[PDB]
Write a protein that binds this ligand. Structure first.
Ligand SMILES: Nc1nc2c(ncn2[C@@H]2O[C@H](COP(=O)(O)OP(=O)(O)O[C@H]3O[C@H](CO)[C@@H](O)[C@H](O)[C@@H]3O)[C@@H](O)[C@H]2O)c(=O)[nH]1
Ligand SMILES: [Mn+2]
Length: 345
């Protein structure tokens, strides 16, 4: 009996994403319902929140300086949340050598988290477009910012983020959901919002971890569009040490985000399938996997040996990488739900 539910749960667990992926690939066929406008030239405020990133901060403001967006339409706000290792002290060094780039560095009381810093920065922002970008993120081309901005021209588009590149099943979901209506996941490498909507929201909330995705999703719910077009590209920043902990800090942010998002309001009809499927994939399906694993483990230790064959196959499939990064993602999600439940105390 426990092999029965193990294979049922395995079927349900792997079938949910594959069916969703097929519906995404049919969304991917339709043409964009909005167009980037290359002559659109709004005032743009780029906000870099920093706590202890000195090597990265000098590479980062180099990266923003090198953007080809008209410098009279651009300003940077760097927010240090009262960090120790003298990154503000590097920041005005870079500001000494680059005076023609409009810059305001703003220092905090002490660290109250990223969203709170973003709201402080927001009361300095003067642009029509507000771009959040993490300090460890580098834009690979001198037109990355301009490309995001072209996509913000349409009045229905409220937010744009990048696709990440060097299983790009992920990127398919991103731009398919983008074309359908909105994608509920944004990337901190580049998150661009129309400031009028941030003011209506108002600001970023301090209780969700995935600031970008939460704002993007709130803008989608408001009847605006939140998209990651394929030509707005950033390279993912990988931390190095503590990779699993970092990936689990991000799973936990996605789990908090989707948990709060589906307990609020009604999505525009084209968005409610998107929201519910991605909330399912982040909050439900991961549990099906290790429950099946344990039922097979019990059936193996006591009695049956088709069960133990299924687990041994499971390992032999741990050799090839797509299945590896899938089951490890499910692992991060389950760990995250656990740490989420026990952290609030
Ligand atoms: N001012 C300020 N800045 C902060 C703080 N914490 C982090 N930052 C800055 O925010 C960026 C990311 O900080 P991380 O600690 O590395 O966060 P993360 O794990 O990399 O995740 C980030 O991106 C995710 C989305 O890709 C988000 O889930 C998350 O909220 C954050 O933006 C960096 O530029 C960092 O200096 C803070 O408390 N105060
Ligand atoms: Mn980071």
């Amino acid at each position: 009996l426990l092999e029965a539910i193990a294979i049922a749960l395995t079927a349900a667990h792997f079938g949910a994403p594959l069916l969703y992926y097929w519906r995404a690939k049919r969304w991917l066929k339709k043409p964009w319902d909005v167009a980037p406008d290359p002559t659109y030239r709004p005032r743009v405020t780029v906000i870099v929140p920093t706590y202890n990133e000195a090597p990265l901060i000098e590479e980062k403001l180099d990266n923003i300086y090198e953007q080809d967006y008209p410098r009279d339409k651009l300003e940077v706000v760097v927010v240090d949340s009262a960090s120790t290792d003298g990154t503000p002290s590097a920041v005005r060094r870079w500001a000494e050598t680059h005076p023609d780039l409009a810059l305001t560095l703003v220092e905090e009381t002490e660290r109250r988290g990223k969203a709170h810093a973003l709201n402080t920065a927001l009361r300095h922002a003067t642009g029509e477009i507000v771009v959040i970008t993490d300090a460890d993120a580098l834009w690979p081309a001198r037109d990355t910012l301009a490309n995001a901005v072209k996509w913000l021209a349409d009045p229905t588009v409220g937010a744009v983020s990048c696709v990440k590149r060097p299983r790009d099943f992920y990127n398919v979901l991103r731009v398919a959901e983008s074309k359908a209506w909105a994608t509920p996941i944004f990337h901190g490498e580049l998150a661009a919002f129309k400031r009028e909507l941030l003011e209506r929201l108002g600001g970023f909330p301090t209780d969700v971890g995935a600031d970008d995705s939460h704002t993007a999703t709130k803008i989608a719910m408001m009847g605006y569009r939140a998209i990651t077009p394929p030509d707005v590209v950033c390279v993912e920043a990988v931390p190095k040490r503590g990779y699993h902990a970092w990936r689990i800090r991000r799973a936990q942010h996605l789990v908090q985000h989707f948990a709060k998002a589906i307990r609020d309001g009604k999505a525009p009809p084209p968005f409610k399938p998107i929201l519910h499927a991605e909330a399912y994939l982040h909050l439900a399906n991961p549990w099906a996997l290790p429950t099946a694993a344990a039922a097979l483990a019990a059936a193996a230790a006591a009695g049956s040996l088709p069960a133990a064959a299924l687990l041994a196959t499971g390992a032999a499939l741990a050799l090839y990488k797509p299945y590896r990064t899938w089951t490890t993602m499910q692992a991060y999600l389950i760990a995250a739900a656990v740490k989420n439940l026990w952290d609030k105390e």
